[PDB]
Enzyme design. Structure first.
Site, PDB file in Angstrom:
ATOM      1  N   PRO A 120     -10.357   1.451  -5.997  1.00  0.00           N
ATOM      2  CA  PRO A 120     -10.623   0.005  -6.006  1.00  0.00           C
ATOM      3  C   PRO A 120      -9.497  -0.820  -5.377  1.00  0.00           C
ATOM      4  O   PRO A 120      -9.787  -1.840  -4.753  1.00  0.00           O
ATOM      5  CB  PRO A 120     -10.708  -0.317  -7.496  1.00  0.00           C
ATOM      6  CG  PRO A 120     -11.207   0.945  -8.113  1.00  0.00           C
ATOM      7  CD  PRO A 120     -10.567   2.056  -7.324  1.00  0.00           C
ATOM      8  N   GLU A 123      -7.564  -8.380  10.369  1.00  0.00           N
ATOM      9  CA  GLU A 123      -8.272  -9.571   9.916  1.00  0.00           C
ATOM     10  C   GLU A 123      -7.773  -9.865   8.501  1.00  0.00           C
ATOM     11  O   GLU A 123      -7.475  -8.943   7.738  1.00  0.00           O
ATOM     12  CB  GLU A 123      -9.784  -9.314   9.887  1.00  0.00           C
ATOM     13  CG  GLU A 123     -10.201  -8.230   8.890  1.00  0.00           C
ATOM     14  CD  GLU A 123     -11.691  -7.960   8.877  1.00  0.00           C
ATOM     15  OE1 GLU A 123     -12.476  -8.923   9.023  1.00  0.00           O
ATOM     16  OE2 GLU A 123     -12.074  -6.779   8.717  1.00  0.00           O
ATOM     17  N   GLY A 132       0.823  -1.192   0.000  1.00  0.00           N
ATOM     18  CA  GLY A 132       0.000   0.000   0.000  1.00  0.00           C
ATOM     19  C   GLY A 132       0.859   1.244   0.000  1.00  0.00           C
ATOM     20  O   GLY A 132       2.016   1.217  -0.429  1.00  0.00           O
ATOM     21  N   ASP A 141      -8.220   8.728   0.052  1.00  0.00           N
ATOM     22  CA  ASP A 141      -7.600   7.973  -1.026  1.00  0.00           C
ATOM     23  C   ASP A 141      -8.460   6.791  -1.454  1.00  0.00           C
ATOM     24  O   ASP A 141      -7.958   5.686  -1.613  1.00  0.00           O
ATOM     25  CB  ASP A 141      -6.202   7.503  -0.614  1.00  0.00           C
ATOM     26  CG  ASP A 141      -5.391   6.988  -1.790  1.00  0.00           C
ATOM     27  OD1 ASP A 141      -5.757   7.326  -2.936  1.00  0.00           O
ATOM     28  OD2 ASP A 141      -4.401   6.251  -1.572  1.00  0.00           O
TER      29      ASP A 141
END
Ligand SMILES: O=S(=O)(O)c1cccc2cccc(Nc3ccccc3)c12
Ligand SMILES: O=S(=O)(O)c1cccc2cccc(Nc3ccccc3)c12
Length: 302
Positions: A134, A85, A17, A131
């Site tokens: 998808p 998770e 990321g 931000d």
């Protein structure tokens, strides 16, 4: 009960990321599979901006079925391991997998609905995503979708480093940000989500620009160059230049052909130029587009 990195078996890198890389890990002590986001922070000027940690604390406060679950936070000298998770995949990879048939309308409508629920929850808690794309939206087998990889404010910016290739972040970026206004609102996430709505229906990104000015012109070519009429105060915007080409607004039957009037009604409300007219997350939920909304299972695979 204190957790340590020695407790976790790494299995594989599931992606990267804005602020690190994310690993699929196996808690050797539970057998439970989790996602770890590693964070090299810079004790640079000692960190602790006091704007940065204030927002991060608003983030940890958030508990909602449509925001990724943060389980634990592991400190090691000069490192932070965020335990999340484990989830199945992201919306982009999902859209790519089924770009040949498209995502059925009920699933589009369901995802959109849950995302507005998650944003509405954030917005009433003084949290913005900043931000929305998808790439950083996560799905499970239940049929759920969750907000992830939140952005950080004030330009820079909490004491972390990134290591990121050039953005495609621009594609979903609200116009008021691209014209340089200093204070923006929650409406910037509604815009981004609106763009994603369109991409889910058309199987293609609405505004794929390669620069800030290129991004604005793509918006302009589609929705029309805005004036003081459509958007009061636009001409005085910090980065507004009267030299902007004038484009006529295109119609939605061509921009998003499979959409009916209810979808186009909602999409146009989400893509409003003026942030003070652009529909809110809470109000979007009450839209007749979501009258028959269900929770379909995704047809998933690797
Ligand atoms: O607040 S924490 O829960 O730690 C936290 C949780 C999740 C992400 C964080 C990112 C930057 C700093 C933190 N705090 C921090 C504070 C002091 C030293 C090191 C990190 C973050
Ligand atoms: O990972 S996110 O998915 O955004 C996320 C999801 C859920 C809760 C979070 C709490 C604190 C920081 C996050 N991210 C973050 C952002 C910037 C720097 C460090 C951590 C949280």
């Amino acid at each position: 009960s204190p957790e340590f990195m020695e407790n976790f078996q790494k299995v594989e890198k599931i992606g990267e990321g804005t602020y690190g890389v994310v690993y699929k890990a196996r808690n050797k002590l539970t057998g439970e599979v989790v996602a770890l986001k590693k964070i090299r922070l810079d004790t640079e000027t000692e960190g602790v901006p006091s704007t940065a940690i204030r927002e991060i604390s608003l983030l940890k406060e958030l508990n909602h079925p449509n925001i990724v679950k943060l389980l634990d936070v592991i400190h090691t000298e000069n490192k932070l391991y965020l335990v999340f998770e484990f989830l199945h995949q992201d919306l982009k990879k999902f859209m790519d997998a089924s770009a040949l048939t498209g995502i059925p309308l009920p699933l589009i409508k369901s995802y959109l609905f849950q995302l507005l629920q998650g944003l509405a929850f954030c917005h009433s808690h003084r949290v913005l995503h900043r931000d929305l794309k998808p790439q950083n939206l996560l799905i499970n087998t239940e049929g759920a979708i969750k907000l992830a990889d939140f952005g950080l404010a004030r330009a820079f910016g909490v004491p972390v480093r990134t290591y990121t290739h050039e953005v495609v972040t621009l594609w979903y970026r609200a116009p008021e940000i691209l014209l340089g206004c200093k204070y923006y609102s929650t409406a910037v996430d509604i815009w981004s989500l609106g763009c994603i709505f369109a991409e889910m229906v058309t199987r293609r990104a609405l505004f794929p620009g390669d620069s800030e000015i290129d991004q604005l012109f793509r918006i302009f070519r589609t929705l029309g160059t805005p004036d003081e009429v459509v958007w009061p105060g636009v001409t005085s915007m910090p980065d507004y230049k009267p030299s902007f080409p004038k484009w006529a607004r295109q119609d939605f039957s061509k921009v998003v052909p499979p959409l009916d009037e209810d979808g186009r009604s909602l999409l146009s409300q989400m893509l409003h130029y003026d942030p003070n007219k652009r529909i809110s997350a809470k109000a979007a939920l009450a839209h007749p587009f979501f009258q028959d909304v269900t929770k379909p299972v995704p047809h998933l695979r690797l």
